[PDB]
Amino acid sequence: GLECDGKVNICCKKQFFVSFKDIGWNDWIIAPSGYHANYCEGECPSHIAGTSGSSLSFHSTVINHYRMRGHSPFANLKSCCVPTKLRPMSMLYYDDGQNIIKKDIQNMIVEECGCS
Amino acid sequence: GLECDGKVNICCKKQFFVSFKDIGWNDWIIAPSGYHANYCEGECPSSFHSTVINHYRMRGHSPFANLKSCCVPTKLRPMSMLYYDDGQNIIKKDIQNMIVEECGCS
């Protein structure tokens, strides 16, 4: 996907450092202390609706069929800058099961952004 | 997530069938003849990742304060497709990101 930079106002990927101390979950999360989660933000004008960087999925291609030619409700449904690919991250934490757990938690890190 | 009925106002999956004959794609796509593509619709009012973003938005934090949460696909499934290629060979291939399987708030 696109990453933000000087003069990029459309949907793009930016950094976002998560501190577990800062949000008060350092009591249950042992490791890591904080990590690069990233995030997505910016305008989704119609000429990039549904895209994920320089790819357009098959699903997004069907939706754009309807949107390009103004069918309802697809002509109206807004397009939003959102993660389209995320990665898991190993975490060590206290869980209710009563104990300390290590496991890959899915969907922790934004790898690619796209327009819904 | 949820599946839309006509009652729940929160983000849910809307069932939506597409015929390839209908939209003119059946000259390239041999099989299947259509499928349930589905889509997302519904409010995202007041994912680990989305979770942490939500935390900061709820504080007055000038990064995420104005960042709107949207109803978007959170899982998509592949489907087996048979189609002609740019050399008119019949190709059988799993195509990814064909079906919206679940919807969530961003």
| Residues B41/B71, Cβ–Cβ less than 8 Å | yes
Q: Which of A72, A59, A54 is nearest to B98 (CA)?
A: A59
- At residue B31, φ and ψ (nearest 5 deg) are -155, 140
Enumerate the residues of chain B whose CB falls inside 8 A of the CB of residue A57.
76, 96-98
Q: Residue B58 has which token pair?
A: 């709820």
B85, amino acid identity: D
CATH topology of domain B1-106: Cystine Knot Cytokines, subunit B (2.10.90)
Exposure string over A63-76, b if 16+ CB within 10 A, otherwise e: bbbbbeeeeeebee
Instruction: Resolution in Å, one decimal, please.
Output: 2.0
Burial class (CB in 10 A: 0-12, 13-18, 19+), A51: buried
A61/A56 Cα distance (integer angstroms): 7
Cβ contacts of A97 within 8 Å, gap of 6 or more: none
Pairwise CB contact (< 8 Å): A65 & B23: yes
Q: Tokens 């305008």 appear where?
A: A43
Please report which residue ranges of chain B form alpha helices under DSSP H. 20-23, 48-58
CB contact under 8 A, A74 and B99: no
Query: How far is A4 from B106, CA to CA, in rounded Å?
Result: 19
Q: Kind and range of the H or E element at A90?
A: strand A81-95
**Residue boundaries of the structural domains of chain B:** 1-106
**CB neighbour class for B11 (10 Å; exposed up to 12, middle 13-18, buried from 19):** buried
CATH topology of domain A1-116: Cystine Knot Cytokines, subunit B (2.10.90)
Determine the distance in angstroms separating the CA of B99 from the nearest CA of chain A, rounded to an integer: 6
Whether B39 sits inside 8 A of A116 (CB atoms) is no
Task: Residue A62: list chain B partners with CB under 8 A.
Answer: 18, 23, 37
Residue A63, H or E segment:
helix A58-68
Sign of the CA dihedral with B40 first, then A59, B76, and A89 last: negative
Phi, psi of A32 (to 5 degrees): -80, 170
Among A37, A60, A78, the residue with its CB nearest the CB of B49 is A37
